[PDB]
Symmetry: D2
Subunit: 457 residues, 4 copies
C-alpha cells in the first residue's frame, strides 16, 4: 500500500507507513545493488549532525524555534536508533551521500509532521547545509567516535592481556626461532612483550591519525565556499557536536576545499588499521603455532578450548580465535585497498566515493574492536604455558654454542655445532671432546645456562 | 527463554525456539565480530549439499531411508530459504566453516525431530563428510551458480546495451581524445564498441575461470584422503548436484589435496571480477565525462535523469549510476585483495580462510551482477547524443592536420597546427595561407572530411 | 661534450656520441624519477616491431627499399641488444610511451645515418604508426614472449620436480595437519601432488590469458581508426611478427578501440601471476615448515644446504629458497595492485599508464620464471624425507580414532580421544580399556593401520 | 679468472678482482632472480653502521684499534660509494639480509687486507652483531634519511609551488564542479589551496611516522636478547649514528623483540606514502583536466610545454608531468601492498621479508621525492590561467540560482534552473520573467555576482 509524494523531478509512490519520502524512494529504486544500508553509527551521526545544525540555525535567528525544536527532537529519535528501518538506501548510492542526506531530512520532516509541525526537508531540515559537507561530516564523526570510543579501548584490553603474559612468563625460557630454525634462547614473556608493544604501537598509530580524521567539512556547503551558510556556521556546529558527544577530537577543517574535494583523512585512518592488521596476523600466527599439536606440532602453550574442533575427527580442538583474527586482518587489508582506490578518484570540488569509503573504514574499526577484545579475553587470558617442555626446547638447540664465539671464534664454534648434531650429543660434550677446554670447564657451563642466555630484564 | 543441549565439550543454553543446537550456540558466543552471517546463496548451497549427500548415503545402503528422507526434506526447506534466521553464525568464524557446517547439521536434526524422526547431526546428517570438504564445496557451488546464473547474464544485458549504442552511433562523428588532449576523429559508436568489447572480454574472463571454479572438494573428507567416505562418494554427490541444479560446470576436484589445502580457484575467479571492475571504471568514467556540464564540461551526451542532484543546488542532476558503478569497482578491488591474502595463508592440509574468501567473492559477484544491469537499463539505454555539438568538436581539433603528413611531412604539418591556433583560424586556411597547395585544393578537402577521417566500418 | 639537434619544439643539446636525438634528450631531462629505463625484452620488442613495420611499408610500396632496409638492419641491431645503453628514458615517462617510441625511431635514424642512409625518425622510421598502437604492441609482444618462452617452461620444471616427489614419496606416511592441529594420516607424496597440481593449474591459468594477452593494437594508429596507416597494415605486421618470433599467440586486436583505450589484457595476465604467487606462498611455507628445526620444529624433511645460515649463530642453515619465493610472491602481489590501478585509469581513446603497467607485469613474469626454476632445482629436487620420524608422527595423532566413527559413533569416539591424551596412552589401549571391543580386536587393528588410513592410489 | 675462498660450508670460486668473498659468491649463485641489488642508500647505511659498531667495539676495548680503524676506514669507503659494484647480491635473497650483511663484512675485510690489516668478516667486522639487528637497522636508517632529507624537502617545494598559485589566483573566479557537473563558483586559487593543504597534510603524515620509523634494532643481536653484544651497545651505536648523520630521529627500539620480529614501522611509513599517492592522483588529475583541450576539453589553464606530444599528430602537446605523477602513484600503491604482505608474514623472533620491504619502501620515497620536485618546477610553477574564459564559465553555470534559496525556496529555485536551460537564457532573466521580483531587482544582482559568490578570504 502506497501514498504519493513529490520532489522537483515529479511524483513518486512511497509506502504508506514509511517515514521517508520521494527522494529516498527514488534512491531505493535507483540503487538495489548490495541491499545493505547505512550502519547504526552512521545513522546516529546524521541524527546528531541535523540536531546540531538546527540548534545553530535557531541560535542565529534563521530558523523558527518551533520548527528547530521539532527538528532537534526528531533528529534525536534518529540518533537514538528509533528509526533505523526508515533508512533503506543502499551503500552504493550517489557518491556524495545526497540520498542518505535527503533520507535523514525526509524522515525528520515526517516525524515532525506527526508532532503537529510542518518542516520542509530542504528549506528547514537542510537549512545552511549541503550533502557535500554534511555527509563527510557524519562520516568523520562516526570514524572518530569508532577510533576513540571503541577501537582504542579494545586495543587497550588486548595490550593489558598481552603485557600480563609478558610479566607472567618473564622467566619461562624457551628456544628462540629465526627463519623457523633453532635459535638462541628467549622467554615466552619476551615474545609476548613484543606482541604487547605491537599493540601499543597500534594505539599510537590510530591516535596519530586523529588530528586529521577529526576534521569536519561542516560549513563548506556545496563546494567549500560556505555559500548559503552564515558566517562561522561550521565552528558553531562543531562546538555543539563537541558539547553533545564529548569528542574533543572533532574540529573544523584546516582547508575547506581539501575537506570536500578529498577524503584523505579516511585513507590515513585506514592505513593505521591496516598496520594493526599486519601486527595482529603475526601475533595470532605465532600463538596458533605455539598451540599446535598436541603431538605433531610445537606444543609450547595450550589455548583455551572454545568449541568442538571437527564434525568428523572426534576430540580435536582448533585455534578458532586466531583464525577469526587472521581472517579479520584480511578483511581490513581488502577494505583498505577499496578505501584508497576511492580516495584517489576525486574530481574538482568533490570526492564522490564517500559512502563506499565510509562503509569500509567503519567496518574495519568494528571488526578490529570486536575481535581484539574476544582475542584478549577468550584466548590470551587463558593461555597456559608448557614450562618443562619449553626448558627442554631451549636446552636442545644447537645454537647454544653461540656465546662461545668470543672465546673460540665463529669458525671453530660451527665445527662444534655440526659435530654435535651428527653424534646426537650435547654442545658441552662436543666442545670438551673437541679439546677446547684449557676457555675453562667452569666458563663453558656459565655461558651454556639457557635462562642466563635469554638476558631477562 | 532457553533449553539445554550438549555436544562433546559439554552443556550449552540455546534459545527454546531456535532450531540450532549446542555447537551453533557456542559459535554465536565465540564470534560476535561483524554480526553478519552467511548469505542466502551460501545457506542454499549447504542445503542442496546436505540433501545430495543424504541421497548418496541412501543409495549406498549406509543411511536408513526414513532418516535420509527426513534429512533430504529438511535440507530442502533450508535450500528454499525457510530457515535463514536459523543461521546466526558470524562470517568471521573458524576458518574451515566447521561452525556453519554444524549449524546446518543441527538445524536439519531439529526439523526432522519435529517430523517424528531422530537423526544425529554428526552420525547421520554429516555421514561420510567433513566441514573440510563440504564447506568449500558449498562455497564453490555458490560461486559457480553466481557466475553462470547471475553475473554472465547481467554482463550480457550490459554488452547488448553497449553494442546497441555502438550500432546507433556508427556515424556520429566526434573528436577523439588522447592524454585528454584534442586528437583525430572517432565516432561515438566506435567508443561504445570498445566498451562493449571490454564487457564481452569480461564474459570470456569469467568463463575461463569456470573449469577450476567449478571443482568441488566433496569426497576428500578431513584431509583429502576420503577416509570415512565410501568409494566414489564425491563423484556420486557431484552427479546428484549436477542433476538438481543444472550446473554442468560443477565437477570433482582434479587433485583432492589441492582442493582443500588451497582455495586457488576463488582467487582465480576474483581476478576475473577485478578485471571487470577495471573495465567498468573506464566505461563509467568516460560516460560521466561525456555527460559533464551542461555548460562547464564536455556536454557530449545526456544521461537519463534518475533523481534530484543536490539538496542545496536546485535543478542540478548528477551521473549517479556511473558513481554506483565506480564505487562498486572499488569494492571489488578491495574484496579481491582480501581474497588473495586469505588464499596465500593456507597451511598443510587445509586453508582456513574459507568464510572470509567466500563472503568477499560472493559479494563481488552480487555487486557486479546488480550494478551491471542497472547501468545498462537506467543509464546506457537512455543515453542521448548531442550530434551537432559533437560534429563541431570534431571539426575544431587542430589534429585534423594529421592526414596531410604523407604529403607535407610531420615537421611542416606541425608548423600548420601551431600557426592555426595562434591565429584562431582553420587548418584549411593555415595550409592555403602557408602556400602548400600546388597537394591540391581538392585533395586538402577530401583529407579534411572528419567522418571520412574516422574510417567507419 | 654535446651536439645540437632539433624537433618541432626547438633545439636541444644531445651528447656527441649518443645515437638518440632531440626528443629522447628532452625525456631524459623531463623524467629523472626512478633512473631505470626499459628492460632488455622491451627494447627487443620495439626493435622487432620497427623492423616488421618497415618491411610492410616496403612491401606496400610506401617506403623506399634503401631506407626500409637500413631501418630493418638498424632495428635488428636494437633487437639483438647492441644498443641498450642508447635507451636512457625513465619508465616514468609520458604514459603512452611516446618518448621510448621516439627513442627507438631516433636511434634507428642515427645508426642508418652511419651506414650512409638518411631516414627521418617520424616520416620514415615511424611511417604508418603512432606510439599509441606501437608501444602497447611492443608491451604485449614482450608479455606474450615472457609467458610462452620463459614462465611456462620454468613452471613446467617446477611441476616436474614436485610431481617427481609426489611419486617418490607415494607411501611415505605422516600425520596430516588441519588448523595446525593433529589430523588423520596422509602421505608426503599426496601433499606434493597437491603442490604439483597448484603449479599445473598455474600453467593453465597463464595459458587461459594468452588469447587476449597476445592481442596487438598495431594498425590502430593514433586513436584506433587506423588513419595514416594503409588497409590491413596491422594484419600484415602481425604476420611478419609471427613469422619472425614463432609466437603464434600474437594476433590483431578484436576491437581496435578497446586495444588502445585500455590495457585490460595486462590486468588479466597479472591476475594469473598473482594466483601463481598465492600458490607459491602456500607451497614454500609448507616446505620451510616441514624443514623447521632441527630440534625445536617439525623436522619432517631436510632441505639442501645453500649457504651458511647466520653471521652470528655458527652451524645454523636457513630455508633461503623458500624465503626468496615468498618475497617474490609479495612483489608480484604489489606489482599486480599497481597494474590494476593504472588499468582502471584510462580516458577516452588512450590509457596512459602503459610504461608503468609494462614494467610491473614484465617484472612479475621474470621474478616468477627465475625463482620457480631455482626453487625446483636448488630446493625441491634435493629434499630428503625423514621417513621413520614421519611414521611415528602418523601413529601418534589422537585423530587415528576417526575411522572407528561408524562402529562406535562420533560421541564415544571423542571420549576415547580425550581419555587417551590425559593418560599418555594409545588409541588402541583406550578403546580396549573402555570395553568397546565385542567392533572386534582384529577390526580395531585394521582400521588403525596408518598407511591404509592414507588411502594411497 | 678466479681465486678460492672458504666459509664454514666449504670452498667457493670468487672472481680474482672481486672484494667480496665466499658467502657473497654463494648468494650470487643462489639468488639470480631480479638481477637488481641493494640501492646506493642501503649500501651507505650498511657502511655507516659498520663504522659505528667498530667504533663502539673500539671504545669498549673489545676490538683492536688497528683492526677497528681499518674497518672504520673501509666502511667509510663503502659509505661514500667507492664500492657499490662489490655488492652484487639480489634483492631477493635470504629474508634476514644475512647475505648483504656478510657482503659488507667481506668487502671490508678485503679492503683492510689491501691496507695491511687482517680482519675476520665474522669475528671482527661483525663483532657484537647479527644480520637480524644490523640489516633492519640499516633499512630504517635509509628510510629515515629518505623521509627527512629527501621526501619532506621535495614536498615542501611542491607545497610552496601550490601555495604560490593559491595566492596568485585568489580572485580568479571560475565554476566549481561537483559530480563533474556545473556547481556554484570557486576561485582557481581556492582549489590550489586545497591541493597545497593535501601536500602539507602529507608532510604531517610522514612526520607522524618518524617516531617509530626511526627505531633501530641495533643491539638486539640474534633474537632481540642482545647475546654476544655488550651492555648498552645499541644505545652507544645509535649515539655514534646520530652524531655522524645528524639524524636525531634515529633511536633505540622501544621493545627489542618487536623491532626484529616485525617491520611494522616500514608498513606504517608506507601508509603515509600511499596517502600522499592518493593526494597526488587527485592533484595531477585535476591539473591535466584543467589543461585539457585546447578545443575539445575544459581549457581552464595552460601547462608548460615539455616535449612534442605525438609521433603521429603534429603540434599536439600532452600533460606529461601529470602522467608521470599518476604512474608514480600507482607504483607507490603497488609497493605498499607488497610491503604489507611481507610485514604480516613474520614468524617468532624474525620477520624474514626485510630486503623486499626495504626495496619497495625506499623506491616509494625516491619516486615521490623526485616526481614531486619535477611536478612543482616543470609544471605547477609555469601554469598560466585563462582568466576571461574562467569568468565566463562561472557566469554560465545554472547553479548560480542557489543563493536565491532563502528568498524563493528550493522548489521555486529549481523551476528557475530548468526554465533557464530550456530557453538558453540567463538566471537573472528567468527569475524576472518568472515574476519573482517584488526579492528586489537590486538584491537579485548582488546575490548573482560570481566572485562575491566564491566568498574569497
Amino acid at each position: 500500500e502506497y501514498r504519493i509524494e513529490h520532489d522537483t523531478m515529479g511524483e513518486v509512490r512511497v509506502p504508506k507507513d514509511a517515514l521517508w519520502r520521494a527522494q529516498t524512494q527514488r534512491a531505493v529504486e535507483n540503487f538495489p545493488i548490495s541491499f545493505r544500508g547505512l550502519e547504526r553509527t552512521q545513522i546516529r551521526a546524521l541524527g546528531l549532525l541535523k540536531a546540531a545544525c538546527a540548534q545553530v540555525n535557531k541560535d542565529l535567528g534563521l530558523l523558527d524555534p518551533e520548527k528547530a525544536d521539532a527538528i532537534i527532537a526528531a533528529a534525536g529519535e534518529i540518533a537514538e536508533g528509533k528509526h533505523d528501518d526508515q533508512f533503506p538506501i543502499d551503500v552504493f548510492q550517489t557518491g556524495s551521500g545526497t540520498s542518505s542526506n535527503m533520507n535523514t531530512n525526509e524522515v525528520i520532516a515526517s516525524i515532525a509532521a506527526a508532532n503537529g509541525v510542518t518542516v520542509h526537508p530542504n528549506d528547514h531540515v537542510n537549512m545552511s547545509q549541503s550533502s557535500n559537507d554534511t555527509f563527510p561530516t557524519a562520516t568523520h564523526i562516526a570514524a572518530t567516535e569508532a577510533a576513540v570510543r571503541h577501537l582504542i579501548p579494545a586495543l587497550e584490553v588486548l595490550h593489558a592481556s598481552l603485557a600480563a603474559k609478558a610479566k607472567q612468563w618473564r622467566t619461562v625460557v624457551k628456544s628462540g626461532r629465526t627463519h623457523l630454525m633453532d635459535a638462541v634462547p628467549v622467554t615466552l614473556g619476551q615474545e609476548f612483550g613484543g606482541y604487547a608493544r605491537q599493540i601499543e604501537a597500534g594505539i599510537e598509530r590510530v591516535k596519530a591519525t586523529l588530528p586529521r580524521l577529526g576534521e569536519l567539512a561542516i560549513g563548506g556547503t556545496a563546494v567549500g565556499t560556505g555559500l548559503n551558510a552564515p558566517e562561522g556556521f561550521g565552528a558553531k556546529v562543531v562546538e555543539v557536536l563537541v558539547n553533545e558527544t564529548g569528542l574533543a577530537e572533532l574540529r573544523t577543517a584546516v582547508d575547506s576545499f581539501e575537506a570536500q574535494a578529498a577524503r584523505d583523512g579516511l585513507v590515513e585512518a585506514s592505513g593505521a588499521l591496516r598496520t594493526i592488521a599486519v601486527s595482529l596476523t603475526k601475533i595470532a600466527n605465532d600463538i596458533r603455532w605455539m598451540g599446535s599439536g598436541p603431538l605433531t606440532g610445537l606444543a609450547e602453550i595450550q589455548l583455551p578450548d572454545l568449541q568442538p574442533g571437527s564434525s568428523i575427527m572426534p576430540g580435536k580442538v582448533n585455534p578458532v580465535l586466531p583464525e577469526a583474527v587472521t581472517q579479520v586482518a584480511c578483511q581490513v587489508v581488502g577494505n583498505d585497498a577499496a578505501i584508497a582506490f576511492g580516495g584517489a578518484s576525486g574530481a574538482f570540488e568533490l570526492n564522490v566515493y564517500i559512502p563506499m569509503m565510509a562503509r569500509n573504514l567503519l567496518e574495519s574499526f568494528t571488526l578490529l574492536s570486536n575481535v581484539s577484545r574476544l582475542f584478549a579475553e577468550r584466548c590470551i587470558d587463558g593461555l597456559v604455558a608448557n614450562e618443562e617442555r619449553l626448558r627442554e626446547l631451549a636446552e636442545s638447540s644447537p645454537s647454544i654454542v653461540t656465546p662461545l664465539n668470543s672465546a673460540i671464534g665463529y669458525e671453530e664454534a660451527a665445527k662444534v655445532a655440526k659435530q654435535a648434531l651428527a653424534e646426537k650429543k650435547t654442545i658441552r660434550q662436543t666442545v670438551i671432546d673437541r679439546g677446547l677446554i684449557g676457555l675453562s670447564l667452569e666458563e663453558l657451563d656459565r655461558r651454556l645456562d639457557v635462562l642466563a642466555m635469554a638476558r631477562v630484564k
